[model samples]
Target chain A: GHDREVQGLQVKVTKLKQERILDAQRLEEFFTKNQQLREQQKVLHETIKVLEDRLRAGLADRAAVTEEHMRKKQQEFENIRQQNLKLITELMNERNTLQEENKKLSEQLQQK
Target chain B: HDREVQGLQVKVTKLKQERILDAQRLEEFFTKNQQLREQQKVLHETIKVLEDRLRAGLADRAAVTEEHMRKKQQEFENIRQQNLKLITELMNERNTLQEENKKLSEQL
Candidate 1:
């Protein structure tokens, strides 16, 4: 049964390597998408803040700036927010989906 | 030897127990967190609906409410909507971070 010794060690090493490769691929996709979303949200929040500030300060001079400006910015913010929220939902949904998939993959490995 | 066989059995028993305990803890944690997330998402969606209503209601209000009061309500609604959106966004970002950490741990 001594041959089992070398066989067991080799199997253990191979499994470890497979796990490591799976991890690296998953991590790379995660960080890249995360950075992009953070940047987009930051810009949207800043835009909303600036537009709100201007609307507040110019309330008295509304006839001068025209409601058109306010409506335009509001539309812009709403569109961007909608887009951001959609992406956020998709991202959250995707992670949940992936976790479930990973669980299945883990089960498969256990069976093997 | 017979003793060696008994020792192996004991080790296997301990390992099986450890795995069972670990799985139980994980099951408890996942259910609780899943419950909280479902609640958060529901509240956020409701807020989004209310905000859209208030935003559309920007058409001049009835003659009774003062502009000051109307403005105040609008401001309050705006803040509430913002807060809800922020919380929702944060929760999503949190899940993303968790997934990233999970992947990294998988690496280790």
Candidate 2:
């Protein structure tokens, strides 16, 4: 056998030229299958690593996006609050001017 | 013969056996302690994770609520602007009506 599991090491490739006893065609087929299995094993390991890396990157990106969104919301709140404050100040000034105009017109009418 | 010793080795088989038993007991205690420690560590880690997740959720929720509040506040500002425009138009209409009344009274 080209591979068997022992103690969960799992990929034990031990063969002492077992294909040598076969006919040439059979030996070539055996070696080709052996090479293919090795390649498959390598690909599986690489795929696992890629998946792990993607998971890590996904978490980081999520955190970053959440943080950015929080900042944007805070900035927006500040802008709205500032706008309300300005409007309130303007209204207060308009009310005071109206009160002054009413008093001045009443005083001028008293002169009649 | 088969027991006790004073200075090093001295090849006391019984004491060696006794020491082995003690070692085994110690190993058992160590394993139990390890288990307890691991459990506590897991609890602490779980607590840490939950706290972190809660903080994160709160932060995100607060942000979403703030966005809602901002949008509502902006709508309020727009409504206030419209109200001001309407008030100005109404005041202009009232002034025209008052001036016409004054001219009619003067003519009479």
Candidate 3:
């Protein structure tokens, strides 16, 4: 009977050893996975930065495109205004010369 | 004889309590691991959507500057790939650990 009890106690000790190994393994696993998760988080942080950068660039481009178009339109408008000013100056000069000719002809007729 | 029996009973109770604690720790660890995987998946999905937007912008090169955006595109791609590799490897290792954990549990 004593022998049987001693054998049973020995079996319990053996089972305890096996469970201890499992605990040890699980503990290490938790540590490893913890680091892995942290690394994943880091990657995501960089991802957010990259996406924001792209959107900002897109907005800047859109703004610049509008500004460029406006500048070109303004230049064209200035050119047309300059051409109209030149035409008005030419008309005034021609009218003055014709008036002078008419006055000369009238004087000739009166003298005759 | 009675002292010997009492001592043995105390030891048995202590072992059972320890086992319960270990089981609780295992459950907690597993719960955390699952959450991490979920987070990893969400991050991947987010990256995918951003890439799509970035690619669309890249398509109309005039719509955006190529000088840095292209450089950034490449950088993001490489980083994503590397991150992907890391996660994949981690999964494989996790599976291996699970098998080992199960085998050890059966041994007990």
Candidate 4:
């Protein structure tokens, strides 16, 4: 009976040893997977940071370009306005001189 | 002795308990990985939206610029037409005055 009991305990020890080995293997697999996930998360974080920076830079550049374009267009409009004003003034002066000349010629003809 | 057998039993029990704890930790890792993947997906979507907005903004600005240019050109053209008309009228009047003055001088 004692021998049979010893054999049973030995068999139990062997089975437990196998189970423990399986558990260790499973733990290793999970640990490796967790490490891979951590690395992927790190890469994703860096990618997000880079994208955000690019977005900010792009928007700032666009704003500056737009401001410069508007300034140039306004200057062009002002220049055209000044040219038109000068033309109008010159035309008015020419009209007055022509009228004055006609009036003097008419007076001379009447005196004759 | 029986004490040795008891020691083996106790050791096996302890290992079984530890295995259970390890299983729990594995479950936690699984949950963490899932959450990280979800977060990454959300970030990717956010980046896509931002890129699209930037492109759209550029297109909108171009359209506005084209419209402004067209309007400015039209305004300048109108001014030019008006000035041309005024000059033509003044030239006609000058011509008429010169002819009248010459006729009057001849008669005198």
* Each prediction's whole-model lDDT (CA): 0.57, 0.54, 0.69, 0.76
- Candidate 4 residue spans exceeding 4 A from truth: A1-16, A103-112, B1-12
Model number with the top TM-score? 4
Interface RMSD of each: 45.5, 19.5, 38.0, 3.5
Candidate 4 chain A weakest lDDT stretch, 10 residues: A84-93
Ten-residue segment with the worst summed lDDT in candidate 3 chain A? Answer: A87-96
lDDT for residue A65 in candidate 4, whole number 0-100: 84
lDDT of 3 at B68: 46
List, residue by residue over B1-108, the lDDT tens digit for candidate 4: 588777777877777787788778778877877787787788778777877876887788678778877887788678777877776777777778778777876777
Give the per-prediction TM-score of chain B: 0.50, 0.68, 0.53, 0.81
| Candidate 1: pairs in clash | none
**Per-prediction DockQ:** 0.01, 0.03, 0.06, 0.39
Per-residue lDDT of A23-92 in model 1, one digit per residue for the tens?
5555555555555555655665565566555545544454344455545656765676677677667667
Q: What is the TM-score of chain A alone in each candidate?
A: 0.47, 0.54, 0.65, 0.76
lDDT of 2 at B102: 53
lDDT tens per residue, model 4, A1-112 = 7667667877877887787788778778877877887787687678778867876786688668877876787788678768866776776777778778778878987777
Please provide, for model 1 over B1-108, each residue's C-alpha lDDT reduced to its tens digit, 9 standing for 90 to 100: 356445555655565565566556556555655565565555556556554544544343223235544665576568557756765876776676667657755754
Give residue A45's lDDT in candidate 3 (0 to 100).
Answer: 76
Candidate number that wins on lDDT, 2 or 3: 3
For model 2, how does the per-residue alpha-carbon lDDT over B1-108 read when each residue is reduced to its tens digit?
A: 112212223323444454566556556655655565555555556555655665676577568757866786677678667666755655565555556545544544
